[PDB]
Structures are given as structure tokens and as C-alpha cells.
Design a protein around this ligand. Structure first.
Ligand SMILES: Nc1ncnc2c1ncn2[C@@H]1O[C@H](COP(=O)(O)O)[C@H]2O[B@-]3(OCc4cc(F)ccc43)O[C@H]21
Ligand SMILES: [C][C]([C])[C][C]([N])C(=O)O=[S@]([N])(=O)O[C][C]1O[C](N2[C]=NC3=C([N])N=[C]N=C32)[C]([O])[C]1[O]
Ligand SMILES: [Zn+2]
Ligand SMILES: [Zn+2]
Length: 810
């Protein structure tokens, strides 16, 4: 008897499914929008990417079989840093690089039997897409959500551009993990995402997303209970407002500090102090914010010779000015609480100011004297009637009391900052603004979009050196002012890649509209995304930014939903066994040579055998005569451990790779790509083929029609097992439990073998085989389709999903 042979059959079915257009989505649709995170065309796709993309294909096929109108699209996140950094690293022009990579990625997807509605392809670096970036940008400008501001920004010296706060990961560039970001002062474009902070927080509650992602976004947004508190100045009319995120500490405010630039600094200075204060104010203004944000620097300040009354204690406190208080934040004035704020602690110690404890540490009380500030939550003490209150609650109680007594007011604030979107890079969407010497910043009219990127041909011209490459090109930026008609300069910064990806899932609903980003009728018919699949690395990047874009476009009236992704599933990383290099072992201790340690990215030069085990590593004898330390590491280019699709499917096959992926572990978990997994996939597919091949002749002479209620013995038993299997596989598919679905098919395959020991090929067996192939199709579609055609005329796409007999489960 012949054996399963994936060669030839896969190419045959791949072409068939595409020709037939089974995965073409209707312009207006039950619907299911199954979305996977579209890739940066920055390199070869490997099995890691293909775990994400096979997962979407499984669900898309399953839903399509059930009768849903299914939208399952693909496209290219082709602008900004990832495409351009990759092209530039290999001295290639971005456009050439991007389209070569797209061609390769398409083939990788096709060869795995993944099916998209390719009629909905988007390529974000094309003006047919980026013109709509520009349109959205103009609407944001119009609605008070896009602005230019001077201030401190994060700078990647390798990218040679500013980055958004979200693109800084443990102090490093999201793209250059070895490179600490630096601070610069620059005038840049921002999207006012903080205008949506409360909605972004509150609207997480209804969401079928992993709790870890919700927690990351909650922490990132970082809502806090704050207050403005008024301090009356002794002998004066003015009451100084201070902004505080610790209103619970008010009874411990022992002095006030005003920014040097605060109008009251010179206004309140005693006559004899004025000279000294003015000199200090002038010295401060000679510094940069960075310089005033510097630490380890001398603590400086001047006492103004003025006092304020603490509104809680009714006690007189001195008013100082000091460099460390910045004029542009809060009210430009602070209450200093040396017992609980370390900056104030060090200042008070230097200048001999009182330190007063008002938050007690739970467990062991704070010592006397206090040697450093106590900055964590505790129990209010020396705080009059608030004594004993847990301090976070006490914030709310002090705010209520302030408001009641006319002494201040609650002010809610957020850790979240506005989104720095402009980039000093060529390969990105031009910002649709003009700078006129007379009018200021003026928008490009909607009717002139796109503002086309100029076609720079020389890679060395494009290479970013600190300024936008477009600054070298007056043929692009020299223009006329739309407002007054005089000479003006186009903005020369471009939009970050995350602009593009914040609405692509809407473009897929209307991919060729040349009058709007999309028609709301079409978007609203397909939205929200029923199931989104992609990596947790986007938790506060794309998965936050997209929610902002959707709420904005909703507020413009263009989108009915306020949440773009109703379900989000974060897939764990595919890892590969990776050689980190030689080690030496003596007893229980493994010595790591420097190059081995550095590749592992760990501080230890010595690990115990137990440490090696616990990190998932092992020691393997090498030909070089040493033991090498091997460990699973995330599949990626940087580790040189990618399993690429072309070579693998040529040597083995697509269904083999699909089963390897899908069976390895729960999809939310990490998995290791292994030879054992590949062999297990072969064993299963071979066993399916063998069972059906063994019975092919008998199956051809058997009808599938029977009456379930007349079955007896093993026939009745098989019918029950069949429906148990169907229930389990269907529910697992709905839940993305893909590995246990496959386990259920493996177990039912065993049942089919066991059945055939006692029973011949019967009508019920034929129906079981039919149903088996239908249930197999989302997972191993090529084999399923191959065997289906041995007995039945049309595609598995046309066969439907089998109907569950609930009575069979009793
Ligand atoms: N213009 C300014 N320059 C320098 N520092 C300023 C400031 N305005 C306020 N602050 C300080 O930073 C906290 C958060 O404010 P932002 O959210 O950063 O603006 C505020 O709450 B806090 O007030 C009392 C207190 C007690 C404590 F145990 C810890 C902290 C504070 O000090 C204020
Ligand atoms: C933002 C947007 C939505 C997205 C972007 N574009 C991204 O991210 O792209 S990339 N990077 O290309 O990616 C895509 C996807 O895929 C995945 N992955 C990768 N790698 C891997 C492994 N190794 N495993 C698993 N998975 C994976 C990611 O995550 C995403 O989702
Ligand atoms: Zn960088
Ligand atoms: Zn003008």
C-alpha cells in the first residue's frame, strides 16, 4: 500500500482554493472578521510568524465552513522604522527592499496553505494608503488632537530619530535593544491621546482580551488621584495653588517651592531678598530643562522672605524658589513634603527645613530621625481627623474635605503622555502641514492630498543623519501658503509607522475607496474584529494606539463601535533550540566563558546544573570536543534560528508544519519547534492516510445513509464517539484551543482503528470518515481535501460543518 506524500498535492489544492475564491469576502455581509497582525516586511517570514498566521487560517476556514461570511485579510506594514532600518542595514533602497520582501512573504503564506482575500491587500507605503493617513491627520488637527510643541523628547542615536514613549522599552529603543535612548529638546508633532485617557481606561472593562494586556494598559495610562491645594500667603491676597499627586501628605508640607519663572517668585520676594532672587531667576533661565532635570547636580534655592499658611495645620511655612521646580508642569509650584518625597528630603536636609512624618509604614514604624523619605502607601498619622486612614483612601478623603471647605479641588491626572508622531526619517507619510513666515502653521487642503513623498533614489541621501532627509530637498519643501499665497515650507518630518497600523483593519473593509479612508456602511458591516491574533509586544503600542484611533473615528461619526477588537488572543512565541557556545563543568558548577555568557545575555559566569535545567537549557557534546550550552530562544533573525517556510515545506510539507505548530502547546503558551514535533506530525498524517487508504475500496461501495436509532453494539458506540469528538473539536476551535482539538482528532482516529478491528466498513463508519475530513480541514487542509476527493465531488469549503447530535451525547 502507498503512503502519505505531501509533494504535489499541496501545490494542487493551493491553486484550487485561490482560483475558486472560497476566501473572498463580500463587500457587505452572520459574519466573522478574523484578523492577524500584519507583518513588517523587514525580513524573511519564519515559523514564528506562521504560528500567528496559521492560527488565523484555522479559524477562518472553520468559520467559512459553518456558513459565516468571513473576512480574513493580509497586507504590509511597510512604512517607517522596521522596513527602512532593514533596507538601510543592507545598503538597499526602502522601496526595492520592501517589495522584494512582500513577494517573499506572499509565497511563504501561500505555501503553508494560508488563504486570504487578496483583493483587500493594503500596502501602507503607497500613496493610495498614506493619503488617508494624511486625511485622518487633518481631522485630528481640526478637532484639537494634533499639535506642535517644543519639549524634551526620547532620541535613538542608531535610528537618528525621536521615538514615542511607548517605543522606549526598559530604557532602550524598541528596535535597538542594545541602545539606550537619549533626551533631546525639539519641536515635534503630537497626537493628543490623553484626551481619550479615561475612555481608554474605562472601556477595557467590557473587553474579551487577556487580563495581562488589560493590566499593562491600565498601568501605562496610570490614572491617579490628585489635587490643587491653595496656600494663603501671610500678609497677601494671593493664595498659591499647588498641584500634588499626594494630597494624603498635606499635613506634612513644611515649605512651598515655586519655579524660578513663577510670577510670584519675584512678586513675593522681600525687598532685601530681591537682588538674590533675581540673580537666581536669571541663572535658572540660562539652563536647559535637561540641565534642570539633571540629578546629582547641586541642590540650590533661595528663601523668598515670605510665608504661607498650611491650610490643614494652620501653620506658617516658608516660601522658597528652587531650580528643581519647573514652571511648565502642574501649577509651577509645589508643596514640599520631605518625609515622603525623596527630592524634598534631600533639599530639606541641605537647607535645614523641617521634616514631618504623616504616613506611617505598616509593620515596623519609621525610625526617628528619618534617614530617607518614606514614599510608599501607609497609614495617616499627625493628620488630625484623618489619623488611621489608609493613605490611598486618604487621598480621596482629603480631596473631599478640601472641596467642602473651599481649600482646593480634586484633579485627576494620568501617567499617559501625548503621542509623539513625527520622525526625522525619509520612509514614512509626509505630515500634511505648511509653515508660513506670516500665518504660522497652516494645513494642506484635503483636496491636495496626497502630499507625495519625493522619490529620492540615492541610499546615502536617504540615510538619516540627525535631521529629516527631506530637509536637503527644496524641490519638495518649497511651496506656497494655502492661506495667504506667499512662500511657505512643507513640514519635513514624517509620521511614525504606528500611525499606519492604527487603522489598517478599517481599510480592509473598503480597500479601494479613493474618497474616504473607508465608507462607514462597509466598515460598520464588518466591525468589530471578532478575533484578533498577535503578539503581546504591542500591548501599549499598536493595541493602545488603535483603540485611540477607533474612538476618534467613532466620534467623527465614521465608526459605530468604540472598540476595534472585540476578541484579542495573544499567541506565545515560537522558540528554537539555539547553541550559545562552549562551557566547562566541574562538579555541580558550569563555567561560562565570556562569549557564551554574552550570547546568553545573563550576568552569571557560573551556573549550577540545576540552574541550567531550570532555565530550559541542556549541555550537548560538540565535535569541537567541548560541551555546548543549548537553550530554546525566540525564533527570529537576530538569533539566527528561524525555520523558513520554503525550505521546510519543500523538504517536508505544509500540513506537517501546521500540525507541528498547532499541536505543540496551547497557542497562548510559548512552544519549541522540534524534530520530535515534526516526526509526530508525520506520524499522525500518515496514520490518517493509511486508515482511509486501507478502506478506500469498501468506502466507495458503501452509502453513508443510516438511522442512528437503529445502530447497535460497536456501531452505536462509534456514533456516540463521533459526536463527542465533534462537540469537543467545535468548542476547542471557538476557544482557539487548537492543540486539544488535534488531540481529540488523534483520539478519534484511534477509535476508528479500534472500530475496524471488529467491524467492517459500514454506513456509520463512512459518515465518521466524512465528518473526520471536515473536522481535519481547518488544521491539515491539503490532506483533508485530497482524501475528500477520493469519495465526494466538491471542496470541503462547500461541505459545511457537521451538525452535532446532542442526543448522541447522552
Ligand atoms: N512643576 C513641578 N516641578 C517639579 N515637581 C513638581 C511640579 N509640579 C508638581 N510636582 C511634584 O511632583 C508630583 C507630581 O506632579 P507631576 O504629575 O509630576 O506634575 C507632585 O506631587 B508632590 O506633592 C506633595 C508630594 C508628596 C510626596 F510624598 C510625593 C510627591 C508629592 O510633588 C509634586
Ligand atoms: C503593528 C502591527 C499590527 C504589527 C506589526 N507590523 C508587527 O509586529 O509585524 S511583525 N514583527 O512582522 O510581526 C507580525 C506578527 O508575527 C508575530 N511573531 C513574530 N515572531 C514570532 C514568533 N517567534 N512566534 C510567534 N509569533 C511571532 C508577532 O508577534 C506579530 O503578531
Ligand atoms: Zn533605534
Ligand atoms: Zn501664509
Amino acid at each position: 500500500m502507498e503512503k502519505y506524500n505531501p509533494h504535489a498535492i499541496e501545490a494542487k489544492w493551493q491553486r484550487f482554493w485561490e482560483e475558486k475564491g472560497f476566501m473572498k469576502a463580500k463587500d457587505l455581509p452572520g459574519k466573522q472578521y478574523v484578523l492577524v497582525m500584519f507583518p513588517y516586511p523587514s525580513g524573511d517570514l519564519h515559523m514564528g510568524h506562521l504560528k500567528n498566521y496559521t492560527m488565523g487560517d484555522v479559524l477562518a476556514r472553520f468559520r467559512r465552513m459553518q456558513g459565516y461570511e468571513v473576512l480574513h485579510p493580509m497586507g504590509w506594514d511597510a512604512f517607517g522604522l522596521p522596513a527602512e532600518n532593514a533596507a538601510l542595514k543592507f545598503g538597499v533602497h526602502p522601496k526595492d527592499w520592501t517589495y522584494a520582501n512582500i513577494r517573499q512573504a506572499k509565497e511563504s503564506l501561500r505555501l503553508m496553505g494560508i488563504l486570504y482575500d487578496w483583493d483587500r491587500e493594503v500596502t501602507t507605503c503607497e500613496p493610495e494608503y498614506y493619503r488617508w493617513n494624511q486625511w485622518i491627520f487633518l481631522k485630528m488637527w481640526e478637532k484639537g488632537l494634533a499639535y506642535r510643541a517644543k519639549g524634551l523628547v526620547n532620541w535613538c542615536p542608531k535610528c537618528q530619530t525621536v521615538l514615542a514613549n511607548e517605543q522606549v522599552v526598559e530604557g532602550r529603543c524598541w528596535r535597538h535593544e542594545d541602545t539606550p535612548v537619549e533626551k533631546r529638546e525639539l519641536e515635534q508633532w503630537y497626537l493628543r491621546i490623553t484626551a481619550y485617557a479615561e475612555r481608554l481606561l474605562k472601556d477595557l472593562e467590557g473587553l474579551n482580551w487577556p487580563e495581562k494586556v488589560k493590566a499593562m494598559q491600565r498601568a501605562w495610562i496610570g490614572r491617579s488621584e490628585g489635587a490643587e491645594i491653595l496656600f494663603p500667603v501671610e500678609g497677601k491676597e494671593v493664595r498659591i495653588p499647588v498641584f500634588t499627586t499626594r494630597p494624603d501628605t498635606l499635613f506634612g508640607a513644611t515649605f512651598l517651592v515655586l519655579a524660578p519663572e513663577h510670577p510670584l517668585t519675584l512678586e513675593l520676594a522681600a525687598p532685601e531678598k530681591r537682588e538674590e532672587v533675581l540673580a537666581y531667576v536669571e541663572a535658572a533661565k540660562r539652563k536647559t530643562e535637561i540641565e534642570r532635570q539633571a540629578e546629582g547636580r547641586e541642590k540650590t534655592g533661595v528663601f523668598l522672605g515670605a510665608y504661607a499658611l498650611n491650610p490643614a495645620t494652620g501653620e506658617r511655612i516658608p516660601i522658597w524658589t528652587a531650580d528643581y521646580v519647573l514652571f511648565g508642569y502642574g501649577t509651577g509650584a509645589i508643596m514640599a513634603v520631605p518625609a515622603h518625597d525623596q527630592r524634598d528630603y534631600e533639599f530639606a536636609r541641605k537647607f535645614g527645613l523641617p521634616i514631618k512624618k504623616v504616613i506611617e509604614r505598616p509593620g515596623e514604624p519609621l525610625p526617628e530621625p528619618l534617614e530617607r523619605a518614606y514614599e510608599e502607601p501607609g497609614i495617616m498619622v499627625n493628620s488630625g481627623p484623618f489619623d488611621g486612614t489608609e493613605s490611598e483612601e486618604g487621598k480621596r478623603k482629603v480631596i473631599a474635605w478640601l472641596e467642602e471647605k473651599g481649600l482646593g479641588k480634586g484633579r485627576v491626572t494620568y501617567r499617559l503622555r501625548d503621542w509623539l508622531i513625527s520622525r526625522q526619517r525619509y520612509w514614512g507619510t509626509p505630515i500634511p502641514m505648511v509653515h508660513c513666515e506670516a500665518c504660522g502653521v497652516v494645513p494642506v487642503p484635503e483636496e491636495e492630498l496626497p502630499v507625495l513623498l519625493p522619490d529620492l533614489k540615492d541610499v546615502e541621501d536617504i540615510r538619516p543623519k540627525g535631521k529629516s532627509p527631506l530637509e536637503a530637498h527644496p524641490e519638495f519643501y518649497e511651496t506656497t501658503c494655502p492661506k495667504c499665497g506667499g512662500p511657505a515650507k512643507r513640514d519635513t518630518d514624517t509620521m511614525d509607522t504606528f500611525f499606519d497600523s492604527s487603522w489598517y483593519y478599517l481599510r480592509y473593509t473598503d480597500p479601494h475607496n479613493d474618497r474616504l479612508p473607508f465608507d462607514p456602511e462597509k466598515a460598520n458591516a464588518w466591525m468589530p474584529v471578532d478575533q484578533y491574533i498577535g503578539g503581546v509586544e504591542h500591548a501599549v503600542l499598536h493595541l493602545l494606539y488603535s483603540r485611540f484611533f477607533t474612538k476618534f473615528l467613532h466620534d467623527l461619526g465614521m465608526v459605530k463601535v468604540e472598540e476595534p477588537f472585540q476578541g484579542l488572543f495573544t499567541q506565545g512565541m515560537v522558540l528554537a533550540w539555539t547553541d550559545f557556545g562552549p562551557v566547562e563543568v566541574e562538579g555541580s558548577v558550569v563555567r561560562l566563558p565570556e562569549p557564551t555568557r554574552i550570547r546568553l545575555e545573563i550576568p552569571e559566569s557560573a551556573l549550577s546544573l540545576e540552574d541550567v535545567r531550570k532555565m530550559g537549557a541542556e549541555l550537548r557534546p560538540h565535535e569541537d570536543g567541548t560541551l555546548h550550552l543549548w537553550k530554546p530562544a525566540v525564533m527570529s533573525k537576530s538569533k539566527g534560528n528561524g525555520v523558513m517556510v520554503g525550505p521546510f515545506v519543500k523538504e517536508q510539507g505544509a500540513d506537517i508544519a501546521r500540525i507541528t505548530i498547532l499541536f505543540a502547546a496551547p497557542p497562548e503558551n510559548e512552544m519549541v519547534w522540534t524534530e520530535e514535533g515534526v516526526q509526530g506530525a508525520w506520524r499522525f498524517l500518515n496514520r490518517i492516510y493509511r486508515r482511509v487508504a486501507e478502506d478506500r475500496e469498501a468506502l466507495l461501495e458503501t452509502s453513508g445513509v443510516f438511522q442512528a436509532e437503529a445502530l447497535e453494539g460497536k456501531d452505536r458506540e462509534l456514533y456516540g464517539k463521533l459526536h463527542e469528538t465533534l462537540k469537543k473539536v467545535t468548542e476547542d476551535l471557538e476557544a482557539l484551543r487548537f492543540n486539544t482539538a488535534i488531540a481529540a482528532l488523534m483520539e478519534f482516529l484511534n477509535a476508528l482503528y479500534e472500530y475496524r478491528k471488529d467491524r467492517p466498513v459500514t454506513p456509520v463508519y463512512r459518515t465518521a470518515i466524512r465528518y473526520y475530513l471536515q473536522m481535519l480541514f481547518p488544521f491539515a487542509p491539503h490532506l483533508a481535501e485530497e482524501l475528500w476527493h477520493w469519495f465526494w465531488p466538491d471542496s470541503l469549503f462547500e461541505a459545511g460543518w457537521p451538525e452535532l447530535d446532542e442526543k448522541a451525547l447522552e
